């Protein structure tokens, strides 16, 4: 993993994008790894890391989500990609278009014969000024569900510690969609959208923390 954690590789932190579509039997996380993108936390970080490590692949398939009435591809100087502002490669920061942010309501069926892992997020602004500037609504909401599951997250406005210029945060969540099931994403603000899904596998893959060099 060199300078990257597995979770940073998953999300597509620019300095970790070298790892796009990589596979492993054993992922080796180094103590020198660092994040260099939008500050985030993952409720149940340990589980997401585990399930991805066990899946043993970062194979990602972009899907043609349609986001009507919003601006796409938001970026940040907290997460530079080359010389300019940027963002996680696998996530799509949606904001208002013109003076409105509509209720987004989109669906993506799983018509394949494997499980899809979707990674998405919710933005927590540091201020009301921020909240409304981006999303127009004074308080947002993100609801992501399948035919038998649902997770709803309400963003929470307020300051966190300053990190790479930012007192705001993104929280990362995930949803698995089985063959014949379907994903629905419904949001009226604060959605950090997926760009597609990671293909799930089963097998012998895992992850280990070590600073030992790798020999031939």
């Amino acid at each position, epitope marked *: 993993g060199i300078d990257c954690t597995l979770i940073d590789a998953l999300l597509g932190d620019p300095h970790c994008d070298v790892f796009q579509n990589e596979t492993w039997d054993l992922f080796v996380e180094r103590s020198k790894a660092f994040s260099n993108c939008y500050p985030y936390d993952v409720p149940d970080y340990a589980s997401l890391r585990s399930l991805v490590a066990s899946s043993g692949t970062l194979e990602f398939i972009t899907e043609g989500f349609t986001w009507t009435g919003v601006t796409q591809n*938001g970026g940040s100087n907290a997460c530079k990609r080359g010389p300019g*502002s940027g963002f996680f490669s696998r996530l799509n920061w949606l904001t208002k278009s013109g003076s409105t942010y509509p209720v987004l309501n989109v669906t993506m069926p799983n018509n394949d014969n494997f499980d899809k892992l979707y990674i998405w997020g919710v933005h927590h602004p540091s*201020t009301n000024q921020e909240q*409304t500037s*981006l999303y127009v609504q004074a308080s947002g909401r993100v609801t992501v569900s399948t035919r038998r599951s649902q997770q709803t997250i309400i963003p929470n406005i307020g300051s966190r510690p300053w990190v790479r210029g930012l007192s*705001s945060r993104i929280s990362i969540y995930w949803t698995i969609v089985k063959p014949g099931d379907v994903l629905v994403i419904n949001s009226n603000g604060n959605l950090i959208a997926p760009r597609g899904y990671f293909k799930m596998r089963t097998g012998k893959s895992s992850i280990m923390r070590s600073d030992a060099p790798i020999d031939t």
Partner: antibody
Framework: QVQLQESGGGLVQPGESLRLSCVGSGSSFGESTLSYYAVSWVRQAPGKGLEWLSIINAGGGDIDYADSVEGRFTISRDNSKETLYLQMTNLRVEDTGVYYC??????????????????????????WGQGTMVTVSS | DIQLTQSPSSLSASVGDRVTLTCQASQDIRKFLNWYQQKPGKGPKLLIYDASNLQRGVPSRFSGGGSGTDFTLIISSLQPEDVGTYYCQQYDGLPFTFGGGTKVVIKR
């Protein structure tokens, strides 16, 4: 709404230089100020129409110039002062006119959120200043 | 450079008249077209953005239409305060350009 006010205009000899400034005040949606928006300089010669000169994005990038002033004028901004600048050099008689700074309507960045629009929209000029007169004459 | 041609150069009309101003682009600019009003000695003010959207605060008697190369600004009932010059302006591609203006003149 954001409000604009240009200054620095006056009479200058051909060949000389001159620095125009533009100060943003007020605020728009989400208490946004000028430093959230892309801005252009546009000028109007006496009795004539409007001529776009240059654009600069909220964060200082994506600069572009009209051919008539490329290589002589330089656009810049100090967001800590909510101020835009146009540095003109090697002025000629035909640069004479009223200079407006004009804000583009689409939000381009939110610093408190680390957000920056991927692209420079450069849509309609929803706010104009009152303009500043530049005369290039002997 | 995209050329915008406005006609007529000058238009005279009576208070209450329905007035139509036209803009023709030398190339297809889709709907990336804005209309401004400029009163003499004052800065321009946005009336219509992206061909058909009424800017907040602009009187509702202003409306805009068209796409591609042919556009119109319509004043449904001319008011005396409408005298001045109207410019169309294009942002499909740099450099941004403005029409040569249409002056509205009241017959009274």
């Amino acid at each position: 709404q954001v409000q604009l006010q240009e200054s620095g205009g006056g009479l200058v000899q051909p060949g000389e230089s001159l620095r125009l400034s533009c100060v943003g005040s007020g605020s728009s949606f989400g208490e946004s100020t000028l430093s959230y928006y892309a801005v252009s300089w546009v000028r109007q010669a006496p009795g004539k129409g409007l001529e776009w000169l240059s654009i600069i994005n909220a964060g200082g990038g994506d600069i572009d110039y009209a051919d008539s002033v490329e290589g002589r004028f330089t656009i810049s901004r100090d967001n800590s002062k909510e101020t835009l600048y146009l540095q003109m050099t090697n002025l000629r008689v035909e640069d004479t006119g009223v200079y407006y700074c004009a804000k583009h309507m689409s939000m381009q960045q939110v610093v408190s959120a680390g957000w920056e629009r991927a692209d420079l929209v450069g849509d309609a000029f929803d706010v104009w200043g009152q303009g500043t007169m530049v005369t290039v004459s002997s | 450079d995209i050329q915008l041609t406005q006609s007529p150069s000058s238009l005279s009309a009576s208070v209450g008249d329905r007035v139509t101003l036209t803009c023709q682009a030398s190339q297809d600019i889709r709907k990336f077209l804005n209309w401004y009003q400029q009163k003499p000695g004052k800065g321009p003010k946005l009336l219509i953005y992206d061909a058909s959207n009424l800017q907040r605060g602009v009187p509702s008697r202003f409306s805009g239409g068209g796409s591609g190369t042919d556009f119109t600004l319509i004043i449904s009932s001319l008011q005396p305060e409408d005298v001045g010059t109207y410019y169309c302006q294009q942002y499909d591609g740099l450099p941004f350009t403005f029409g040569g203006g249409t002056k509205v003149v009241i017959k009274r």
